Amino acid sequence: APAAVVTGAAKRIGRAIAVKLHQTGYRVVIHYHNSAEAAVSLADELNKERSNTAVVCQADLTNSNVLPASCEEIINSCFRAFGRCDVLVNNASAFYPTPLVQKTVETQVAELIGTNAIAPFLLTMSFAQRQNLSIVNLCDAMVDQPCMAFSLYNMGKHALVGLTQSAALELAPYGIRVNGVAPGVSEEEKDKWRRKVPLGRREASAEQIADAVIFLVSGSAQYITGSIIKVDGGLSLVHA
Amino acid sequence: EAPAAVVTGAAKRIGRAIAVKLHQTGYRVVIHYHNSAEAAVSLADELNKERSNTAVVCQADLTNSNVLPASCEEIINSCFRAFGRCDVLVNNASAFYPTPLVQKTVETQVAELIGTNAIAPFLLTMSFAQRQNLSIVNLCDAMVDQPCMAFSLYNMGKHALVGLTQSAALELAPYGIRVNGVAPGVSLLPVAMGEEEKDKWRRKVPLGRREASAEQIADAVIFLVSGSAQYITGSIIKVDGGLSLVHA
Amino acid sequence: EAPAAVVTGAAKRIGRAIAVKLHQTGYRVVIHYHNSAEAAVSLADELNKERSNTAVVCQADLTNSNVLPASCEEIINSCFRAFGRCDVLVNNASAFYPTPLVKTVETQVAELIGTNAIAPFLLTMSFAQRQNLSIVNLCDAMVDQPCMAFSLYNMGKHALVGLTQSAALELAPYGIRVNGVAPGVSLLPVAMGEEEKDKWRRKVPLGRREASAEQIADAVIFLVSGSAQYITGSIIKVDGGLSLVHA
């Protein structure tokens, strides 16, 4: 049985990814930063289905002198639990506005660029160095119609498109595929967003995102590398 | 009942693999073909041996002309006549040959290249929608932005198909119809291409230094028509082994 | 010694502005038109009063048909016949109207795909066969967030991006550059109520206004200039940031 690392797996999209990979037959490393209770609750549910198939791993993914070691630790944890590491899902993300005109700004850089781009880079290095192997990066379908005042966030998501493509090229000789899934929209403010989605009749779910990840790690995607699949209900096609 | 799909240019290569994989999934299929009647009929025989009454053939030229609308309406009508429903449309048929800018008539080249690649998909899409997990899949080209030299009209047609995929995804979403694309890089090489040229192409692909099988292309089509893609519309999935990422 | 340019759909609006600015820059111009004969002639008369023997008109339907190749060959030949050379081609003419998925549809195809794509393709072939040479295609900045029910128009504009790129690649060895200018919202329809024009104007980040024809023309003048000698295959958005705005 193969093994997968999912970053930010305690909640929301990462949790759904971890569940679906587990349902597919993977052993999973559930990475978390602050959500230890939720991480361990998930691992408890998964291990009750199949014993010793889920572990947790704590790491802050903010950029800092120690982030490379932290990322090597996450990958190492998968090898120590399971003896292998077939899949890496870069799901963890920080998200908040950083206006250009008026935490320090450099802490924002560390958290937005670090979590969203540099940690994926370092995880990707550690994953490859230790080697159907495939990395999936959680991108953003709205990368080229960005939210107002989200410059740093958007820079980091752009940088992650760059990583996806550069790592796809560079790791292809090692048989490692590298792809992305780009959610769009995944309560008055929540309804405003839902009514703009062309496929709005359906509610967006974490499960839907997870379905795309499962496709890309599967044997049905064996020739796919460097691809980013939008899972956005058509929202990125909608003009202002 | 079992859902039903139309696959254009289904007698051979990628279209044939799509038809087979849809039929293995549970769909009843219309095997559209233009010249390859023996292959189309042999495929329908094979599929019907596995399940009776689950495949039919439909012949049509998809070159643009004043009767193309009627031809495309007839292909969708053929699926309703055989199966009583039409759930999936795969726009696979394509003309492909060079049209140099500097030295068949050029109008015939337009009709064939733009017709098969773009206008026939558009008209099929209109007829599919009008006749109503509904979904259209367009076979695009991952190398559309790094085109082969002297293939202007082909490239124009494949860009127009990207436009149709996006415009139809937007317009048809209220009707429950998803519209997506699959973009091969190099898959099955042309029957006419020489051995040495085939190898040159295969050596460029980062992922394995080989072309995609037809079945690998079909696998992406399968995903996009499946319930695991219910929130995906307007997306074009490259299935190219990294080839579009490789600089000159 | 003065260079010459063909501008399609040049009687009015953006094409007229382009023609004027090329003339101001020193080009002799072919003013192509379809229905707008009085406006095309008034422009040519205006430009020839500024400098004699610097403007002609050429009428043609750019709808696709059996005869479109010969029409496009004629348009290019008209520049050589008047001016002895053809340095610049600007593919500006365009049909634009909705074609809902749910005039015959084949006439719509001929018009929308012809004007926006096939005529540019044929003009490009005739331009190159007859040879700072450069083609500029008028594209659409909103081609990836299209208007609802405009599929044929959007198909046509996407095909023109493909032509721009394919032609840039193939014509580079002949020294011919091929680029695009992609407006967002520029001159609004004639009949459109101010209330409706203002809904579009308020979307534009940059000044909450549409581009003037002149501002589109300025990008065309840049691309044909010596300041753009290394630029080919590029499409310059002239959209005030409109394509960057989410739903």
Next chain:
Amino acid sequence: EAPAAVVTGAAKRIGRAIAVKLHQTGYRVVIHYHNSAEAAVSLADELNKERSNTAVVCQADLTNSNVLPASCEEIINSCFRAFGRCDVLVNNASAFYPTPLVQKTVETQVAELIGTNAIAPFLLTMSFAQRQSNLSIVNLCDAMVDQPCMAFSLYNMGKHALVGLTQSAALELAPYGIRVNGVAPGVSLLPVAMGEEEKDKWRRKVPLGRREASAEQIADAVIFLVSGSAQYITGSIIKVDGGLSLVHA
């Protein structure tokens, strides 16, 4: 009163070409430089000899650090200190080297590649906007960012982030009348270290003329974007690549 521009990494090569052409157009210029002090001063002397009191130098490391925000505020402040205004910012300075995924610390590489290429442009854009007519920012991008060189992941990440900044800042700064655009070279001046044969390998790939862009040709696109002939253009990235990005493998 003549307008004023800041050009990062302006002592040599493309940055020098941009500073020169902005000066020739009538701008007063801040020539930012990190290590090329003798080249920066030689350039400022040449410009000042053409028109007195129209060029100054400004030294800064654009590596990311906790002081980078102050450094970037000081670069902008230097233009107001010399000239009393700052109309144009050209983000040109760039670190460029390979960072292979499979085997300077990697943190230092991050700080240098992502700092120069992305974070410093972001901090400079914040400081330019805060200190505020034809105001505009031009970011030096990379036409090949989608067909990247092997083993240049961090560089490519930084250039992709710069695309994002160009678009996000165009959107946010448009209400203030500040336009934000890019110029994306393909191959222009080849690296100083590169041998002739390897330079020719790159040259032979370019459709338009089988040669690299001159520095002047890159600067031409920057001058257009900062001109009144680009007054409606914001969020646009102009490729200046001779067709290179269109060439398949």
